Design a binder for this molecule. Sequence first.
Ligand code: SF4
Ligand code: FES
Ligand SMILES: [Zn+2]
Lengths: 95, 94, 118, 112, 125, 148
Amino acid sequence: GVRTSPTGEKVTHTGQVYDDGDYRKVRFVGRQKEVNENFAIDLIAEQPVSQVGSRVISCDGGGGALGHPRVYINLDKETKTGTCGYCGLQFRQQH
Amino acid sequence: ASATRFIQWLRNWASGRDLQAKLQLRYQEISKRTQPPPKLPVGPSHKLSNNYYCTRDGRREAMPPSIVMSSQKKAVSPAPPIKRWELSQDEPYL
Amino acid sequence: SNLIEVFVDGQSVMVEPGTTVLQACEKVGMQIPRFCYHERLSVAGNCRMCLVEIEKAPKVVAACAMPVMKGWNILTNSEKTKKAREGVMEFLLANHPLDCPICDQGGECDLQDQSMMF
Amino acid sequence: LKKTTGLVGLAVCETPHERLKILYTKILDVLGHIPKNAAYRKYTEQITNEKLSMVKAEPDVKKLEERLQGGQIEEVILQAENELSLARKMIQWKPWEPLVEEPPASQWKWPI
Amino acid sequence: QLITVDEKLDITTITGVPEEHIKTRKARIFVPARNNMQSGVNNTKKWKMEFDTRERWENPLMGWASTADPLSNLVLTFSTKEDAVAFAEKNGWSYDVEERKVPKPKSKSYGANFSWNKRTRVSTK
Amino acid sequence: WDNLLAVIPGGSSTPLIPKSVCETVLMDFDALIQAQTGLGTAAVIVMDRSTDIVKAIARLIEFYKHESCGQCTPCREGVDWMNKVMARFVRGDARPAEIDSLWEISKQIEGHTICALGDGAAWPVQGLIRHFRPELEERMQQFAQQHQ
Ligand code: SF4
Ligand code: FES
Ligand SMILES: [Zn+2]
C-alpha cells in the first residue's frame, strides 16, 4: 500500500521514493508527486482461489477474445495453488 | 432544414440551384452511431487440410534476377507501342 | 584421399566417411533445421526436425544421425523435405503453451524462429 | 489539314510526307558513316527503312499515322529529328567498340 | 585522360567528421559471435565494424540513458575483412581486426552411443 | 457371414478391411498388401455388424497412445493428438472437414518417426477413414441435429 517515507514522500508500487538529501525531490515543491493508489499486487491477492475438479485448468483472463492468450495450468502439486502467468488468478484442485 | 419558405426561395433563386434537395449539412440520413456487431469472413487459407504452407508461400517463390548479359535479327522495343486513346462517349468536350 | 563424393541440391561436395547428412549440408553453407541435435553432445535423433529427402529414396532420413553415402543427392529444399518440417513443427506446437509474451526466450527462441522459417 | 496537334509547342506541319522523306533519308546517309557491322547501324537502318516504306505507300496523313503507330505525324517528325541527332552523336561516341573496362570483382553483387 | 595519384586514399578532410571522432576512436573489425542462446548461424556470415563504447549516464528528469557519443549506434557491414580494413584506412580510424572464428569440424557417430567397451556409451536416451 | 462388418487381418497395426474385401482375400503378405492392409502377425480380429466400428478403432488409437515411448516428436504428440480427435469422432462432436485433417495428421506421423509404432498408429486410422467415411460423416450429422 501507499506508504509515506519518513520525509513524507509517498512510496510508489515500484518501491520508488527519493531519499533524504536527493535534490530531485525539489521538482515536487509547490506541486505534487503522481502516485497511483490502486496497487495491483494488493488487488490480485484479494481474489479468492477457485476450486476446480480436474488436474489441468485453462485461463484466458475472462471475456473471451478480450482477455489474454489462453494458457493451461497444472494443479498436481497440493502444497501450493496454480497461478496464471498472465493475470495472476489462482486455482486449486478440489480433492 | 429549418429555413422558412421565403428564405428557401430566395437562396434557391440566388444560386440557380435547388439547394434543399442536396443540403451540405447532414441530418437524419446518416448512419446510426451504434451499429450491430460485425461477423467478418475468413480468408482462403483457413482450411483444415490441403493447406500446406509450402504450396502457398509467395516469398519463397521470389527468385534472384535473371542475368541477360554479363561482361564476365529484327529490332525490338521494350514493349509494343501504346495504343492510341479514344475520346469519351460520356462527354468528349467539357 | 578417402573422401567420398556426395551432392547437396546437385552441388558436389567431398566429405570424410562417417560425415552425417547434416554435416554435408553445412559444407555448402546450408543449415538444416534442428532441435535435439547439438554438435558438442551425442547424437539423439528424437526431435525429427532435421528430416530431409534423399533423391530417389522413398523415406526421409534424420540428417543429424544419418551417415552420408557415396553419390547421395540431398534435396534440402524439396517439397517432401519442406512438408516434413511443417508436420514436425505442427506437432511441436500442438501442446506448447501460448507463453511468448511472458516467456524470457521470446525474441531469441529457436522454436519461434524455425516456426517462422520452416 | 489539322487545326492543331493537341500538344503545346508542337506546330502543325504543312507537308508531313515531304518532311518525313527528307529526315529518314538524312538518317540513312549519316548511318552510312558508321561501321557496317555496328549494331546501331544495322538496327537503325532496318527500322528507318520500314518507316520510310510506310511514308511512301500511304498518302493519307490520318492513315499514315495509323501505320507508323507513333502518335501524331508531328510527333513522328520530331522523333526522326531526335534519331538524326542521335546518329550524329553516335559517330563521335563510337559505342560499338569493346567494353572500356570490366567493373571491380563484385561491383554488381547484391546482397553483399 | 587519367592521372597518376601515388598516395594512400585519405578522405578525412572531406567527410565532415569532427576532429575528435577520427583520431580518438577505436574501430573493431570482427565477425559477430553466434548468439549462444540459439543454434542458427545466419548472423555470423558478414564482417562488422563498430566503435569503442563511451559513457552513458542517467537523464535527471526521467532516468533515461543519455549519450554524448555520436558514433554509439554506428555499425557497418562488410563482405570481407579486407573491405572493412580499407574503409577504416581511408577514413582515418584506428582499428583492431579479429580473425573469424569458424566452428571446428566434429566427428559425430550415432552408433557410438552403444559402445561395447568405450566410455561414449550412454546411460539414457 | 452376412453379419460380417470388417476384419483386421494382422493385429491392431494393420488397417481394417470391409466385408467385400474379405470375400476373396488370401491370407499372405503380398495378397493383403494388394488389399491395402498387411498380414502382420496374422491375428484376425473379426467385427460383426453390431460393432461400433469407430469406437473399436478409437480404442486402438488409445492403445497406441498408452504405448508410445514418447521418444520422438511425431508419435509423442501426434498419436495423442489423433486419440483426442478419434474420441470426438466417436460422439460425432466434430465437423466433416476434420476427417481430411485427421488423414493429413496421420500421414505426418507415418514415415517420420524413429520406429514403426508411429506407422502402426496411423494405419488403423487410415483404414477407418478409407472404408467407413460415411459412418463418420453420419455420426457428425446426427450429433449436430441433437444440439440445435
Ligand atoms: S514412434 Fe517409436 S520411437 Fe517414436 S515415440 Fe513412438 S514408440 Fe517411441
Ligand atoms: S535434429 Fe532432432 S532428429 Fe535430427
Ligand atoms: Zn489468466
